[PDB]
Design a binder for this molecule. Structure first.
Ligand SMILES: [Mg+2]
Ligand code: NA
Ligand code: NA
Length: 284
């Protein structure tokens, strides 16, 4: 019944987006609403097992059984999902912000899945409410996380993001961690340029890690902000390699694999604004 893709010629995108925004977002809202039920036929029965309750930050934001990531051993559960990219079916893992009680699980996943790049698009605390544990070391001294030892080699705090490098050893690898630090507590970032430049930076590093497993992306719940980051990564790659861009199809594909991947119309609009602004700047 529903469209799975809405490709737009790059030179028609500005006017396409204007058409969507016309009349108080009349058509934009219609297109966005077509995505509403994507993926929603899937269950989350494993995440709901009593043994797993304490492992979910939010008891109503859970991975689908079909696409969840499994930890080795006899407690396999983590609140994390495999997500496709432009390039590969399991190009990302989306997860919640680790809890104090699940940070060892998070690091275990990072080790087992051969992760080399982690993207974080939440603060640990937002207006005094905890959103994510500070699940990495505070300084350069080593610490265990479960059966792994981790050392933070460097921490570089820049105006809109912070980049850390960790050395990890389990049963040695360098991991980079990209922490975007200007996402407002509510709504979308206040400029397009900030997130565009952050995504470009991360994508540069991912491209230099051709051996790596999935890129991990998280916010507090692993929901809209994470979906918006991944959708933007996918769409900007399209702008660099193709004559068409398919924001609708990117969001559709993400929603097939985890709930709330791009979760507000505002985020959907923001993705279109980013693409618009990239194309406008080109024409400089
Ligand atoms: Mg110490
Ligand atoms: Na330790
Ligand atoms: Na929003």
């Amino acid at each position: 019944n529903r469209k799975t893709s809405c490709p737009i010629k790059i030179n028609q995108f500005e006017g396409h987006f204007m058409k969507l925004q016309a009349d108080s977002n009349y058509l934009l809202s219609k297109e966005y609403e077509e995505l509403k039920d994507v993926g929603r036929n899937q269950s989350c029965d494993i995440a709901l097992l009593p043994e797993n309750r304490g492992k979910n930050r939010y008891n109503n934001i859970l991975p689908y059984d079909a696409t969840r990531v499994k930890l080795s051993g006899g407690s396999d559960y983590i609140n994390a999902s495999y997500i496709p990219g432009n390039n590969f079916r399991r190009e990302y893992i989306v997860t919640q912000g680790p809890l104090p009680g699940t940070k060892d699980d998070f690091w275990k996943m990072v080790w087992e899945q051969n992760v080399h790049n982690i993207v974080m698009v939440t603060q640990c605390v937002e207006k005094g409410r905890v959103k994510c544990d500070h699940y990495w070391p505070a300084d350069q001294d080593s610490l265990y996380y479960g059966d792994l030892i981790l050392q933070m080699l460097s921490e570089s705090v820049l105006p809109e993001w912070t980049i850390r490098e960790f050395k990890i050893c389990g049963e040695h690898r360098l991991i980079r961690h990209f922490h975007y630090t200007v996402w407002p507590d509510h709504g979308v970032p206040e400029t397009t340029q900030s997130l565009i430049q952050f995504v470009r930076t991360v994508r540069d590093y991912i491209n230099r890690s051709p051996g790596a497993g999935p890129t991990v992306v998280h916010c507090s719940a692993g929901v809209g902000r994470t979906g918006t980051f991944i959708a933007l990564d996918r769409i900007l790659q399209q702008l660099d390699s193709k004559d068409s861009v398919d924001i609708y199809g990117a969001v559709h594909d993400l929603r097939l694999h985890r709930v709330h991947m791009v979760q507000t119309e505002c985020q959907y609009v923001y993705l279109h604004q980013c693409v618009r602004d990239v194309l406008r700047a080109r024409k400089l």
